Amino acid sequence: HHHHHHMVHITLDRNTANSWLIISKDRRQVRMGDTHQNVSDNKERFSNYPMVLGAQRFSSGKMYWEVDVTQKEAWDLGVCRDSVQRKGQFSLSPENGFWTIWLWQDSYEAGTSPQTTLHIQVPPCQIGIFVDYEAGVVSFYNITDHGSLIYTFSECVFAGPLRPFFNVGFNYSGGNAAPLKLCPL
Numbered sequence: 001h002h003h004h005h006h007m008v009h010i011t012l013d014r015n016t017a018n019s020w021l022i023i024s025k026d027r028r029q030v031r032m033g034d035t036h037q038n039v040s041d042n043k044e045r046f047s048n049y050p051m052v053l054g055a056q057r058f059s060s061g062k063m064y065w066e067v068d069v070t071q072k073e074a075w076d077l078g079v080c081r082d083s084v085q086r087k088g089q090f091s092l093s094p095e096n097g098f099w100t101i102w103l104w105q106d107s108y109e110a111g112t113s114p115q116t117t118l119h120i121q122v123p124p125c126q127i128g129i130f131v132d133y134e135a136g137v138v139s140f141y142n143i144t145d146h147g148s149l150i151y152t153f154s155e156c157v158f159a160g161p162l163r164p165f166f167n168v169g170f171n172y173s174g175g176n177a178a179p180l181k182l183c184p185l
């Protein structure tokens with residue numbers, strides 16, 4: 001792909017984070033802490049899952065960023081509507097305002113309803129995310145495999161401003177402590 005020139009500098013919004021997440025001082029890395037991180041509750045925080053949003057809101061144009069997933073067992077990445085549900089249980093689907101992929105139990109899947117199997121020969125250490133607001137497109141690229149396409153959501157109905165979306169995943173296994181990191185431009 002040739003989307004690199006739409007690169008945007010994403011930072012994490014502390015105020016949207018689940019109360020167990022630790023966001024780095026530079027707001028470019030996030031990991032799940034071993035306990036509550038001593039923050040007050042607010043209506044923005046994701047309650048049930050270890051999720052956080054980017055600070056940036058997109059309503060037009062073309063945007064590209066990269067995320068490092070090295071040595072993680074489980075994670076979700078993509079974009080979502082600014083107005084997605086924060087509290088209680090919900091599924092990641094376009095009907096709920098999410099355009100995401102994920103890793104879970106050694107398989108990669110796109111957050112369609114129902115979910116779609118992805119065909120990945122080279123486990124990615126970094127993921128590229130491309131959004132074309134006007135075209136209604138969200139695309140995912142395998143940076144480890146020379147930028148090969150993972151998945152394209154097309155005919156997206158964003159229906160609002162978009163925010164970068166992250167889930168560091170559960171760490172029941174003790175094998176998923178590693179952070180998500182926004183990779184430099």
Ligand SMILES: COCC(=O)NCc1ccccc1
Nearest residue numbers: 018020048049050170171172
């Ligand atoms: C440490 O691992 C246990 C675990 O993953 N618990 C579930 C959970 C943790 C934090 C926020 C939401 C849900």
